[PDB]
Amino acid sequence: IGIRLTLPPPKVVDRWNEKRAMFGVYDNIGILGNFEKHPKELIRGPIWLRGWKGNELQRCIRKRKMVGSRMFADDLHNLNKRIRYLYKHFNRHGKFR
């Protein structure tokens, strides 16, 4: 048997949150702020992907480039192995060559 026998607790959502009400504000800041700031500079997150989309292999390569010197030892070993595997997969395997 897989279904729950009861209804899950009703999940209320505050649509007029501070965050939800202020979402999108100060976008278009370059367009109507004399281009002093780019909207890509409003992005918060990892240092290796701010204003950058990239592939998965591209993301791994960029992370090892930008922040791979102050990474943990096991994490960096994992990143190196992932880059190796991804290189092999994206360069030797699949349809469409």
Binding site: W16, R20, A21, M22, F23, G24, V25, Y26, D27, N28, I29, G30, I31, L32, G33, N34, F35, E36, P39, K40, L42, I43, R44, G45, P46, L49, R50, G51, W52, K53, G54, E56, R59, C60, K63, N78, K81, R82, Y85
Partner: protein, 250 residues
């Protein structure tokens, strides 16, 4: 006395400008205190729900970073050795526990690392979206223009009663200029309300204008928006970023 507002920017030969009432927040019934006209290229462009959806989806998705991640069959603890050799018993061939076929194994095609969804629409497209949203707000009787946002009392219930009496709506986006000339009265009144949102002109955006039922600008905000959105037309190629001198560009 009446306050009449014209368009400073050059309206083209055809396309006579559009009109709008100028109101105030000082009085409770102080409607129709003046009359303004608005540039047709900004406030009367084509509907363009295509562009509205484009800009709204860009605003939703360009800043998103997804931190979901799984472990592949190489990052799961253990699993180095081959259990129960290949040919002996009557069990299926396996070269490792932690393979995706195993309970506790790695995920074959799960999410990988922090993923970014960054892309940019052309700034001409985004400015077109802004003009389109302003045009829609005017065309659907959802735009109100004030001489200035000023309240005699400065309390939230006054502003709520004023909006209800003027039949604006439930959610009101008030727009001012420079974030520093915002008067203490409206700042105090709006800092407590939930569906009344005070933003400077620099923060105007398609997502906020669509999320709020009514848009309430001021006359200096109207002129500022007109200038900034019109500059995108009749502009050269960049040739380098517009944060650099560009003699006539402030």
């Amino acid at each position: 006395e009446p306050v009449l507002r014209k368009v400073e920017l050059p309206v083209p030969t055809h396309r006579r400008p559009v009109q709008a009432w100028v109101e105030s927040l000082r009085g409770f019934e102080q409607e129709r205190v003046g009359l303004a006209d608005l540039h047709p290229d900004v406030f009367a462009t084509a509907p363009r729900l295509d562009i509205l959806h484009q800009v709204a989806m860009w605003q939703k998705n360009f800043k998103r970073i997804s931190y979901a991640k799984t472990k592949t069959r190489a990052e799961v603890r253990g699993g180095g050795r081959k259990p129960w050799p290949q040919k002996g018993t009557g069990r299926a061939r396996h070269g490792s526990i932690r393979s995706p076929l195993w309970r506790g194994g790695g995920v074959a095609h799960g999410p990988r690392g922090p993923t970014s969804y960054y892309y940019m629409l052309p700034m001409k497209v985004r400015a077109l979206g802004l003009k389109v949203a302003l045009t829609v707000k005017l065309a659907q009787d959802d735009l109100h223009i004030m001489d200035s946002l000023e309240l005699p009392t400065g309390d939230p219930q006054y502003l709520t009663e004023l909006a209800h009496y003027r039949r604006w709506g439930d959610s009101v986006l008030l727009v001012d200029l420079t974030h520093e000339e915002m008067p203490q009265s409206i700042v105090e009144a709006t800092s407590r309300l939930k569906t009344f949102n005070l933003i400077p002109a620099v923060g105007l955006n398609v997502h906020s204008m669509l999320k709020h039922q009514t848009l309430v600008l001021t006359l200096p905000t109207v002129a500022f928006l007109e200038d900034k959105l019109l500059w995108q037309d009749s502009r050269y190629r960049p040739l380098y970023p517009f944060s650099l001198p560009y003699s006539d560009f402030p």
